Amino acid sequence: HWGYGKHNGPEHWHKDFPIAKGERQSPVDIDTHTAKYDPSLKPLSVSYDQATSLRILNNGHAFNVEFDDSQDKAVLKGGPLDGTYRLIQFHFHWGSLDGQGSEHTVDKKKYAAELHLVHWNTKYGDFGKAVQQPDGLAVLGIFLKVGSAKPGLQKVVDVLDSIKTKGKSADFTNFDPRGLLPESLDYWTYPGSLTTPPLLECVTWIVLKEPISVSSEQVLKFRKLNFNGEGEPEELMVDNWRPAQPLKNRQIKASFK
Numbered sequence: 001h002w003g004y005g006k007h008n009g010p011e012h013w014h015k016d017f018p019i020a021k022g023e024r025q026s027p028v029d030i031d032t033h034t035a036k037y038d039p040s041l042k043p044l045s046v047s048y049d050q051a052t053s054l055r056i057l058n059n060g061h062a063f064n065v066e067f068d069d070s071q072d073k074a075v076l077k078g079g080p081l082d083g084t085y086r087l088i089q090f091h092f093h094w095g096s097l098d099g100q101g102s103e104h105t106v107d108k109k110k111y112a113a114e115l116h117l118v119h120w121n122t123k124y125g126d127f128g129k130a131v132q133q134p135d136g137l138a139v140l141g142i143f144l145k146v147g148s149a150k151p152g153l154q155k156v157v158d159v160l161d162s163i164k165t166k167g168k169s170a171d172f173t174n175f176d177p178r179g180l181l182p183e184s185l186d187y188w189t190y191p192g193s194l195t196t197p198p199l200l201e202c203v204t205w206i207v208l209k210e211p212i213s214v215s216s217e218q219v220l221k222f223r224k225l226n227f228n229g230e231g232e233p234e235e236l237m238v239d240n241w242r243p244a245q246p247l248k249n250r251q252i253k254a255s256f257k
């Protein structure tokens, strides 16, 4: 139904999902000069040493690398968060050209892509219950710029040929998401939403200030994926990003001065 085309893209989503015009929608532009340093924020705790990746799936709007979230194996804590949030999946949004692709922007700057590491609050028991709560999810957002290759991304890049089309999955065990993190964990944070339907307002966003670098060849392989299923007309999976939404009555806080 919904997608990223002229007739079903982000400007149409509100018809099926009226919360698209809600009070805490994502992504947003991060105006760095009006974000306020909050000295009471904590360092983020990203504990991914025991992460168990299982599978990679082309779901028709991105690809998800899925994790075993049936125990506390890969968790996000600290920063703005109360309690423990378990990693369930990561995915990316990217452009047709290097000058666009990110969902969040920084002083109106668009990056080539954006990584979303999705975590759910363990006090709600599972992901489906968590998305119904205002503090149900924590999404760690990381910008990608094109330059040097990211060695830790290459295992993802090289499996994409096997999940070219919508509905295809492949085994994807023993992938270490620590290889996708920048050096610094300095971040901005604000309350927002899922950036795809159902657009639920359940996310504490944590957006890292330092981008990671990926090579032109790596992002080119993202752009060979297909939105369509096998045996259907080829639509390249590109420009699968929602643009910035109104900030409304929200403040963005910075972990750093």
Ligand SMILES: Oc1ccc2oc(=S)ccc2c1
Residues within 6 Å of the ligand: 116, 118, 139, 193, 194, 195, 196, 197, 198, 199
């Ligand atoms: O099933 C969904 C739908 C939208 C989502 O959006 C974000 S931002 C994270 C997870 C997610 C899961």
Ligand SMILES: [Zn+2]
Residues within 6 Å of the ligand: 091, 092, 093, 116, 195
């Ligand atoms: Zn996303």
